[PDB]
């Protein structure tokens, strides 16, 4: 099921037109709210006194139909950036008039074009309308992948078409959009209606729009091909672009007249439904991640905060993750306990941060399949989850498990462990203070003891996403620094974004940490080659961890553990977007800082331009010890 | 009140063209109100217009009439809001206006239409930025040209060269066309956007064009004379049928101007109270000049020769 609309520039009767558009299967109708040829004068007589009515009546549709089925269209004679002053004036008045009519009617969106480079005065008028009341309406800026001047037929004998590659020139319409939305100050009500032409540009032109707020894609009937049976279809390259757009769940708009007159008009739409039904269904992860796409979440702090019951539930609903823990334990048991000692050597296993019991059960299953003997301690500081562990221990585990209600940094263990097992990792690895927690527990690990996990490494990657930048921006709160939202990380299932360079390692930790001078502070400088023109808005963070030897967990995309649902990526934003040109290097700097009470991150971009140091002294974001 | 003729003519009169015998063809659009359609009319008595009860023939179109032109003496070629080009034809009795064909070949409003010398082909320009050449007999598009980069404001066939015609667009291009050339368009050289075009009737390589700023200009194929004639857009330019022709110019300033060879002003009418849309010279009385506008007026000016 695709949500699709019909684009018309001619509506003799609204009720007749709307009925026909719906019978064909469309969900909505883009149409003009004043006759597109009905030029109006606002200054000079006698034409300014043209008797009314100035357009059709609001009583021709119910309020629900205006609210849900109609997208309005700016009249095409309206040119607020004309070089003729009189035309700029009448266009300004007319543009306020049509926009205020759309608001009067409650239309859910309104379409305005970007068809040239200079739309400064159009932006000024739109921004003025936007700051005239508090409404939820959307403005769809109709902008093409390829400017009409760059796709005209080469039929002018004395003005031939440029056949030489112009990398940035071919990206010009993205610059039309960027400047417009920059002038309009990244209004959340301003979105892209991307118009697709018969010939697609270079791939880099397409990727330019990654991370942008695309709400609709416009498909002219002119681009459809024709198969043997006479039905409209699309080239394999166009189909590629459709699939990418279905991943953004945009609304598709069919514009133009029916050029396959042998077939009824619902043909074009039926083909989209055909492309939509043809694609891999939800594959467990994507099935589950959908719903969380680009949704900002505060990172959990299981140390400072006691997690709720349903939060452990989410942890537990990932069998691939714990089967890896079971394999790590299984292998370790066999390396530590030779066959000939299988009945005499009882290994002491300590789960450090057991929550409701998943590792405890994985540890038991591991010792069974390994045919080895283990003595288990289940250490958990959250007394609410200790309730779960102690009902389990009485009902099932029995005396083989000793539940300990304590902080692993303070607990005085009655004996030393052969293996400590922990799940203290966040989306950025150490961002829950696993190093601090495991350092404080090390004293009761044997001299040859093993820690599972044995090491972990965070990764970083620059990304472009004007959508996510705006989401962060909108996280201003009343009683704090008005830019605090940009000085803190977010856990988020990154979706509408462009990764700008291959992720690279940031911070690594090993356990046990034999080193005699333990310092968990960190300072790392990274250099990301960028081969595209783009805008930098933040850094995606991931991690990898070695549980034991070759058994690992990873959410780093290029090595993501297949089938693991746990852990979305994390996002470090920056206060001000940074322009990056093709071939430039993004240099970012990250610090891991601490005092006796808190740990935090600070970060900074130093090339190709310097940003401010973000989160100095943890003024906006700290992680409690 | 002829048969199958609408009892009411739309307000916004868009076209007026005399034919050989002097009958007047009217084109009308409904540009506001519940229904946005249009209509075609024939007045064998041009003084009775635009009264519907005293017309010779009349019919309703599905959509508005952005432009039209005669195709001979019983043919009417229409640029429709629907994107379609339509041909209507009078019956033998000239009491009905029957539709001949209605082809939806443009993807937006058809704004301008012009019949070529041979009278068997026509060219149309649309807001979809394309220009199409039509074979009226086979009812098919022979050629589709995307030379411009923005809407096509005006196309005008050569008076006597069946393969030559002008076009202009909001991309600031004026293009001279010759379909005999492998690349059939040529750019005729910063100014204001061109809005209207008129070939000289007695001079092969001479034409005039109007701009969005009120200027009228006289151009030769190769080496310019111009005059500020209007305070707004110049909607149209129509040479008179005199041996030494006069030049009628129309404008969104609601005025009609008549200019001489050197673009000097000989007449000026402010009779209209809304935009002036078309002007057509009487074939019978060469001094009479008829204009129509969105004020629903049909004015008959006597032009002092
Ligand atoms: C916001 N946050 N910060 C850190 C996390 C998060 C996620 C999953 C795990 C895990 O499987 N194991 N251990 C941890 C920590 N030690 C964890 C932490 C999360 C959460 S809440 C939640 C609830 C529903 C869906 C997704 C998520 C999600 C993620 N990703
Ligand atoms: C599964 S998320 C990590 C788990 O480890 C627990 N935890 C985190 N830090 C400590 C600590 N220092 N001592 C004991 N349990 C901890 C948390 O309460 C949570 O159940």
């Amino acid at each position: 099921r695709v949500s699709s609309g019909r684009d018309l520039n001619c509506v003799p009767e609204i009720a007749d037109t709307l009925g026909a558009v719906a019978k064909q299967g469309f969900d909505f109708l883009c149409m003009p709210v004043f006759h597109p040829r009905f030029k109006r004068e606002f200054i000079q007589e006698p034409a300014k006194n043209r008797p009314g009515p100035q357009t059709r009546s609001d009583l021709l549709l119910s309020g629900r139909d205006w609210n849900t089925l109609i997208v309005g269209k700016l009249s095409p004679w309206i040119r607020p950036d004309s070089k003729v002053e009189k035309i700029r004036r009448n266009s300004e008045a007319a543009m306020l008039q049509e926009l205020n009519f759309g608001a009067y009617l409650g239309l859910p969106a309104f379409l305005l074009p970007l068809n040239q480079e200079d739309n400064t005065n159009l932006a000024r008028v739109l921004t003025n309308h936007i700051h005239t009341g508090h409404h939820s309406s959307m403005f769809w800026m109709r902008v093409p992948l390829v400017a009409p001047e760059d796709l005209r037929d080469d039929i002018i004998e004395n003005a031939p078409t440029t056949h030489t590659e112009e990398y940035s020139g071919e990206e010009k319409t993205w610059m039309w959009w960027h400047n417009f939305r920059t002038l309009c100050d990244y209004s959340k009500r301003i979105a892209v209606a991307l118009e697709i032409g018969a010939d697609l540009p270079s791939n880099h032109v397409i990727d330019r729009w990654l991370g942008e707020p695309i709400k609709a894609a416009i498909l002219p009937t002119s681009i459809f091909l024709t198969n043997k049976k006479g039905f409209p279809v699309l080239s394999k390259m166009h189909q590629r672009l459709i699939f990418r757009l279905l991943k953004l769940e945009v609304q598709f708009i069919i514009t133009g007249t029916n050029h396959h007159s042998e077939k009824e008009f619902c043909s074009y739409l039926q083909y989209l439904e055909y492309l939509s039904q043809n694609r891999p269904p939800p594959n467990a992860y994507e099935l589950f991640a959908k719903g969380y796409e680009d949704y900002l979440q505060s990172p959990l702090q299981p140390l400072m905060d006691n997690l709720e019951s349903q939060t452990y539930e989410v942890f537990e609903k990932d069998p691939i993750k714990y089967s890896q823990y079971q394999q790590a334990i299984y292998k370790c048991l066999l390396d530590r306990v030779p066959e000939e000692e299988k009945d005499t050597n009882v290994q002491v296993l300590m789960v450090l941060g057991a929550g409701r019991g998943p590792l405890v059960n994985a540890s038991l299953r591991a010792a069974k399949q390994a045919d080895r003997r283990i003595k288990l301690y289940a250490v958990e500081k959250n007394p609410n989850a200790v309730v779960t562990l102690e009902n389990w221990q009485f009902e099932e585990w029995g005396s083989q498990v000793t539940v300990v209600s304590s902080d692993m940094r303070e607990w005085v263990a009655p004996e030393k462990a052969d293996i400590i097992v922990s799940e203290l990792l966040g989306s950025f690895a150490d961002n829950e203070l696993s190093p601090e927690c495991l350092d404080g527990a090390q004293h009761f690990l044997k001299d040859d003891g093993v820690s599972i996990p044995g090491e972990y490494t965070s990764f970083l990657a620059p990304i472009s996403s004007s959508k996510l930048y705006n989401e962060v921006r909108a996280c201003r709160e009343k009683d704090r620094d008005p830019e605090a939202q940009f000085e803190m990380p977010y856990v988020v299932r990154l979706h509408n974004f462009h990764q700008l360079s291959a992720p690279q390692p940031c911070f690594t930790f090993s356990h046990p940490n034999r080193d005699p001078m333990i310092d968990n502070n960190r300072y790392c400088t990274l250099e990301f080659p960028v081969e595209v023109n783009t805008v930098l808005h933040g850094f995606a963070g991931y991690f990898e961890t070695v549980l034991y030897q070759d058994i690992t967990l990873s959410i780093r995309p290029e090595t993501h553990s297949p089938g693991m649902f746990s852990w979305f990526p994390i996002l470090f934003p920056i206060k001000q977007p940074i322009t990056v040109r093709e071939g430039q290097t993004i240099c970012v700097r990250f610090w891991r800082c601490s005092n006796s009470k808190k740990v935090w991150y600070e970060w900074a971009v130093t090339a190709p331009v310097c940003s401010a140091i973000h989160n100095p002294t943890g003024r906006s974001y700290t992680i409690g010890l | 009140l002829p048969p199958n003729a609408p009892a009411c003519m739309e307000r916004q009169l868009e076209a007026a063209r005399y034919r050989s015998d002097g009958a007047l063809l009217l084109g009308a659009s409904s540009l506001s109100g519940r229904c946005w359609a249009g209509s075609l009319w024939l007045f064998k008595d041009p003084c009775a217009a635009p009264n519907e009860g005293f017309c010779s023939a009349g019919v309703q179109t599905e959509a508005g009439v952005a432009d039209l032109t005669w195709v001979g003496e019983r043919g009417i070629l229409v640029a429709s809001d629907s994107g379609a080009v339509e041909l209507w034809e009078l019956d033998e009795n000239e009491t009905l206006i029957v539709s001949k064909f209605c082809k939806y070949e443009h993807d937006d409003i058809v704004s301008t239409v012009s019949v070529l010398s041979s009278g068997t082909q026509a060219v149309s320009g649309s807001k979809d930025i394309c220009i199409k050449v039509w074979d009226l007999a086979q009812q098919v598009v022979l050629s589709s040209y995307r030379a411009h980069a923005a809407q096509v404001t005006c196309v005008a066939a050569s008076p006597h060269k069946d393969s030559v015609f002008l076009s202009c667009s909001e991309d600031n291009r004026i293009l001279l066309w010759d379909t005999r050339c492998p690349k059939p368009a040529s750019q005729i050289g910063p100014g204001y956007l061109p809005t209207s075009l008129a070939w000289h009737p007695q001079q092969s390589e001479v034409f005039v064009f109007g701009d969005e700023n009120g200027t009228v200009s006289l151009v030769d194929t190769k080496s310019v004379l111009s005059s500020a004639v209007h305070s707004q857009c110049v909607t149209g330019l129509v040479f008179s049928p005199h041996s030494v022709p006069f030049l009628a110019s129309l404008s969104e300033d609601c005025s009609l101007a008549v200019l001489d060879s050197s673009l000097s002003e000989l007449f000026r009418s402010q009779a209209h109270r809304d935009f002036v849309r078309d002007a057509t010279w009487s074939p019978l009385n060469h001094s009479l000049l008829t204009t129509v506008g969105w004020d629903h007026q049909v004015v008959h000016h006597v032009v002092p020769t």
Side-chain angles (χ1 to χ4, degrees), chain A residues 288 292 296-302 307 310-312 314-318 321-322 325 423-427 429 431-432 490-493 564-570:
Chain A
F288 145 71
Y292 290 104
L296 304 176
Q297 311 169 57
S298 305
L300 294 180
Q301 306 205 13
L307 302 183
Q310 272 167 60
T311 298
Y312 291 109
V314 180
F315 297 174
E316 294 158 15
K317 192 179 182 179
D318 190 0
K321 174 182 56 166
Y322 290 110
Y325 272 101
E423 190 187 2
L424 305 166
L425 297 187
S427 300
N431 57 307
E432 292 176 8
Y490 300 84
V491 167
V492 44
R493 170 56 282 157
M564 187 186 65
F565 320 135
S566 298
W567 291 291
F568 288 153
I570 199 172

Side-chain angles (χ1 to χ4, degrees), chain B residues 77-127:
Chain B
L77 189 66
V78 182
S80 176
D81 273 329
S82 66
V85 173
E86 293 174 36
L87 183 65
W88 301 70
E89 287 188 6
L90 295 159
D91 48 334
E92 290 179 344
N93 205 10
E94 297 193 342
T95 56
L96 303 174
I97 306 172
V98 191
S99 174
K100 203 69 177 180
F101 71 80
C102 187
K103 299 292 174 184
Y104 300 83
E105 292 305 329
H106 283 274
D107 294 68
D108 202 334
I109 301 173
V110 190
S111 58
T112 173
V113 71
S114 186
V115 192
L116 299 157
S117 283
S118 62
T120 74
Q121 297 158 334
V123 56
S124 57
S126 169
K127 292 173 176 287

Side-chain angles (χ1 to χ4, degrees), chain B residues 177-189:
Chain B
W177 296 78
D178 192 325
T179 52
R180 304 171 294 187
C181 302
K183 305 202 173 186
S186 170
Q187 182 159 10
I188 300 174

Side-chain angles (χ1 to χ4, degrees), chain A residues 302-303 312 315 353 355 380-382 406-408 423-424 437:
Chain A
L303 176 66
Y312 291 109
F315 297 174
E380 176 55 54
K381 62 91 183 187
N382 182 351
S406 164
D407 193 306
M408 71 179 79
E423 190 187 2
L424 305 166
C437 287

Side-chain angles (χ1 to χ4, degrees), chain A residues 48-102:
Chain A
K48 70 187 301 286
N49 304 311
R50 171 188 304 160
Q54 301 302 320
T55 188
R56 254 158 191 155
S57 183
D58 55 350
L59 295 169
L60 291 182
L61 298 180
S62 71
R64 186 179 195 192
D65 286 352
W66 296 114
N67 282 341
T68 62
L69 311 180
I70 305 305
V71 182
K73 294 176 61 178
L74 192 76
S75 291
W77 57 268
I78 292 180
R79 300 318 280 161
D81 294 281
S82 179
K83 302 181 184 179
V84 185
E85 182 181 352
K86 283 176 165 186
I87 297 177
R88 292 203 299 270
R89 308 272 219 194
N90 278 323
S91 300
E92 301 185 22
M95 168 175 173
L96 297 180
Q97 180 191 47
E98 299 200 345
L99 286 180
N100 287 333
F101 203 57

